[PDB]
Amino acid sequence: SVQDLNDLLSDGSGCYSLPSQPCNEVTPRIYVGNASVAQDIPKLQKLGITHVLNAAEGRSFMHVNTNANFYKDSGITYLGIKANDTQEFNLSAYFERAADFIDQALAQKNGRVLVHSREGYSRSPTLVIAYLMMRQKMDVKSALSIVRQNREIGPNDGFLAQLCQLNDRLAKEGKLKP
């Protein structure tokens, strides 16, 4: 249940927590951070991050108006996604597209990918989390926990609900790994 997830994320019933800091590699080679890092290029360099996935692409108060050419000639491969951190959102419409990029990302041998959003708390962890499930055979309670353990995160219940569905596509296709 999404409730099953809420509790993984809280600290009892009720308290989710917030990022003690702007960027955290939540899994080897894969980093989840916020707007600033994304827009602080000499850091992405020292971080040796080579790919960006802006999962909150746009110009509203809840988006990062970065874009391809913004990353041109510091040579960082870019991929944008105009998502909305609201329960309505079907972020689960970009799972493949995203995972497919994270995979190409990792394939280089010194490949480091920064999946990010505004706060690096919902839209972002969500993609990343979905990549572990269909790409590392992990069940939902699992990826959440790794990711969660590595960064303080909190996806909206819609996004939560989207992952569970994902869980049973996989689980019932025997794509899991119990």
């Binding site: 989710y16 800091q21 505004r118």
Partner: peptide
């Protein structure tokens, strides 16, 4: 170092 930052409350 380590700041509090924000935001996610999922309704």
């Amino acid at each position: 170092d380590d700041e509090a930052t924000g935001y996610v409350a999922t309704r």
